Design a binder for this molecule. Structure first.
Ligand SMILES: C=C1C[C@@]23CC[C@H]4[C@@](C)(CCC[C@@]4(C)C(=O)O)[C@@H]2CC[C@]1(O[C@@H]1O[C@H](CO)[C@@H](O)[C@H](O)[C@H]1O[C@@H]1O[C@H](CO)[C@@H](O)[C@H](O)[C@H]1O)C3
Ligand SMILES: O=c1ccn([C@@H]2O[C@H](COP(=O)(O)OP(=O)(O)O)[C@@H](O)[C@H]2O)c(=O)[nH]1
Length: 405
């Protein structure tokens, strides 16, 4: 088959979609991976053996008064500047005509589009190509669901699609998957957890963060990362920093800068001096797979993005969960229900957190002997399912069979 894949302009969508493209191309299918040129330039290279089976289709973002050049992804357009988010959604919707012209002569058997690709589902109808909507989260997230707002883009895309695709399996969510047939009349299929192939990410294993981990004792380091895009304002960065200090563990922290905050204001006065040698903060993209694979990392403090949830559990890390938006609440509650992590306590009213809730969550999951040992044993049980790479490949074969029918 020829499959056209159109991910949302966001690295938590681009990365698993490129992995999927390569898994289809491995079974002898052809893929057109459609995105914007700077997003494509920042992706890991395709295995040379799949090179002619994964065609990159670069559609340049239309210039929209005030959207900076190169600002192509949710990693470049900050959630704390909603004016710029809106400008980015306009640029995205401007891909409609270049995309419809491309699909016309693509000889596509299937279009696989992301949640906001309402124009791509419409092109699919125009050119009579079956259209699958990617909803590459948990069964629990999909059960919860069962210009324009995100809700209207989603509903329009869903209305124009014939198939909805989730990233889970009955083995991980036996209580939800057998209950699901359709999302608003559209058949649901699960292509498995599709945990990333470590090699496929092509990270630097000489990265300074990994060389720091090499000097730490086994299971001693709390890895802290909130994915590629969720906002965390400076007051909340300070509370997370002071929480990490109060719990007293070693930590490696991948931190994104809130817009308009200087290097001097970023972190509490003297925080880096007081934690020097015990903790490292990196305000750059880190090799998350090499970090989670490392013997020194014990617990993962995660925003519970679905990629970070799968990646954390596939290496048997118990989770300290700080969900920010979207599917992260459901993802966090799902893992808490399996006893493999604990949410940071939140105020009902604003959803805020403080240093003490952060510290208490780290202590219970990573420090207190009795609780920490239960969290590790429960994360290990989840790893048996999440890291069953053969099982997940069989789910990709199952999804390809769903598409031929
Ligand atoms: C993956 C997702 C599909 C989504 C579509 C809308 C949907 C969901 C919110 C589920 C419930 C029904 C419904 C219709 C709704 O709007 O209430 C659904 C799941 C999360 C979602 O997340 C988005 O992910 C992107 C990266 O992964 C962000 O670039 C984006 O910005 C998130 O959208 C965010 O949605 C949050 C929840 O409403 C908001 O708090 C946040 O401001 C918004 O950006 C948004
Ligand atoms: O510094 C970073 C931050 C994120 N990631 C990767 O980016 C993705 C983040 O996706 P997730 O669903 O966890 O969160 P999102 O960015 O969509 O909120 C995951 O595959 C991570 O391995 C990374 O490699 N380095």
């Amino acid at each position: 088959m020829h499959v056209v894949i159109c991910p949302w302009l966001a690295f938590g969508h681009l990365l698993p979609c490129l992995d999927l493209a390569q898994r289809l191309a491995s079974r002898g299918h052809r893929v057109s991976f459609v995105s914007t040129p700077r997003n494509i330039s920042r992706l890991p290279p395709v295995r040379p053996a799949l090179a002619p089976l994964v065609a990159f289709v670069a559609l340049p973002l239309p210039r929209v008064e005030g959207l900076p050049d190169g600002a192509e992804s949710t990693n470049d357009v900050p959630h704390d500047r909603p004016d710029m988010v809106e400008l980015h959604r306009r640029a995205f919707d401007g891909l409609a005509a270049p995309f419809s012209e491309f699909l016309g002569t693509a000889c596509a058997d299937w279009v696989i589009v992301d949640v906001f690709h309402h124009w791509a589902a419409a092109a699919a109808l125009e050119h009579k190509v079956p259209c699958a909507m990617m909803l590459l989260g948990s069964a629990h997230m999909i059960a919860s669901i069962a210009g324009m707002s995100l809700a209207e883009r989603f509903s329009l895309t869903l209305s124009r699609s014939s198939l909805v695709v989730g990233r889970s399996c009955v083995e991980f969510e036996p209580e939800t998957v057998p209950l699901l047939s359709t999302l608003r009349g559209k058949p649901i299929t699960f292509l498995g957890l599709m945990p990333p192939l470590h090699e496929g990410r092509r990270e630097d294993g000489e990265d300074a963060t990994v060389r720091w981990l090499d000097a730490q004792p086994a299971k001693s380091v709390v890895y802290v990362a909130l994915g590629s895009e969720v906002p965390l304002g400076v007051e909340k960065v300070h509370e997370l920093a002071l929480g990490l200090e109060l719990a007293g563990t070693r930590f490696l922290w991948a931190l994104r800068k809130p817009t308009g905050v200087s290097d001097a204001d970023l972190l509490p006065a003297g925080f880096e001096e007081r934690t020097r040698g015990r903790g490292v903060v990196a305000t750059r993209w880190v090799p998350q797979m090499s970090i989670l694979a490392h013997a020194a990392v014990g617990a993962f403090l995660t925003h519970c993005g679905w990629n970070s949830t799968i990646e954390g559990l596939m290496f048997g890390h118990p989770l300290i969960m700080l969900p920010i938006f979207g599917d992260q609440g459901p993802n966090a509650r799902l893992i808490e229900a399996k006893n493999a992590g604990l949410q940071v306590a939140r105020n009902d009213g604003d959803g805020s957190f403080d240093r003490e809730g952060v510290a208490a969550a780290i202590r219970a999951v990573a420090v207190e002997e009795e609780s920490s040992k239960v969290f590790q044993a429960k994360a290990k049980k989840l790893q048996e399912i999440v890291a069953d790479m053969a099982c997940h490949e069989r789910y990709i074969d199952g999804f390809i069979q769903q598409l031929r029918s």
